[PDB]
Design a protein that fits this description.
This is Death-associated protein kinase 1. This protein is 32% helix and 17% strand. With 275 residues, the chain is of the alpha+beta class.
Length: 275
């Protein structure tokens, strides 16, 4: 599939930088014809068949195809796609309130503040999983706030760079995110499905409530070993006034066997969440 090959600068003016990954940079931008503001994500293309630099066309097209499907208040949306020899440029919805990761860093929360974030994340993932989309990179860095200066900020899930359609219940590709957040099946290179996201939500919930990361070791290999062994516990210093029901929610997500793990539907009916 090909994209718009006109110069993006003929249609948009870029401004401040919003984010910066390994093969991508995101710039605030403004569309000349409407005055409307967006986030332009510049993804570096692979320059040869066998290079390790840049993103393969297959991978870029997958991200774009998935993004084109989605329209939900808790997920980023795609406006337009441009490309040139060097980059594919995704014109995405602007989410200007910063990462949940940075919001947490200024602030740990009350259980109400945590469930207020978590419920929006669950709604977004419910939508994605209903479309058989596994995100595969859920972590606080990939949750963006619309406005961080309100008591209950609204959020959107971003960064669909590892997202896959799961049409046979599982996929068996080269897929591996950030050690602190990946499920044991990722660590062990096993077939992956929607369940991996639910583990990640468990990790996010643990961090939301405590300010601490449940499997984090001193090196990435230690973290991965900890994940595979389900080596986490609820430290009393962090969880002493956290409800047992909150712990129950986490405990039912941080389960090694993906079949025994709560699904997104389970998570919305769980007594800590269910209205
Ligand atoms: Br700007
Ligand atoms: Br579902
Ligand atoms: Br993004
Ligand atoms: Br790590
Ligand atoms: Br699910």
């Amino acid at each position: 599939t090909v994209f718009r090959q006109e110069n993006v600068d003929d249609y948009y003016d870029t401004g401040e930088e919003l984010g910066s990954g390994q093969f991508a940079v995101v710039k605030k931008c403004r569309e000349k014809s409407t005055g409307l503001q967006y986030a332009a994500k510049f993804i570096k293309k692979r320059r040869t068949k066998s290079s390790r630099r840049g993103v393969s066309r297959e991978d870029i097209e997958r991200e774009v195809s998935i993004l084109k499907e989605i329209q939900h208040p808790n997920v980023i949306t795609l406006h337009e796609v441009y490309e040139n020899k060097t980059d594919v440029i995704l014109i995405l919805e602007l989410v200007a309130g910063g990462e949940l990761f940075d919001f947490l860093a200024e602030k740990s929360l009350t259980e109400e503040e945590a469930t207020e974030f978590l419920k929006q994340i669950l709604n977004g993932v419910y939508y994605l999983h209903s479309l058989q989309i596994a995100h595969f990179d859920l972590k606080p860095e990939n949750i963006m706030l619309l406005d961080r200066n309100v008591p209950k900020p609204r959020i959107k899930i971003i960064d669909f760079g590892l997202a896959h359609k799961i049409d046979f219940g599982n996929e068996f590709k080269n897929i591996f995110g950030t050690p602190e957040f990946v499920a044991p099946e990722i660590v062990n290179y096993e077939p992956l499905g929607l369940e991996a996201d639910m583990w990640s939500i468990g990790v996010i919930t643990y961090i939301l409530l405590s300010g601490a990361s449940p499997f984090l070791g001193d090196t990435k290999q230690e973290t991965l070993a900890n994940v595979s062994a389900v080596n986490y516990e609820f430290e009393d210093e962090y969880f002493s006034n956290t409800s047992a029901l909150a712990k129950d929610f986490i405990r039912r997500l941080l389960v090694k066997d993906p079949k025994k793990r709560m699904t997104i539907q389970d998570s919305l009916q769980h007594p800590w969440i269910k209205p």
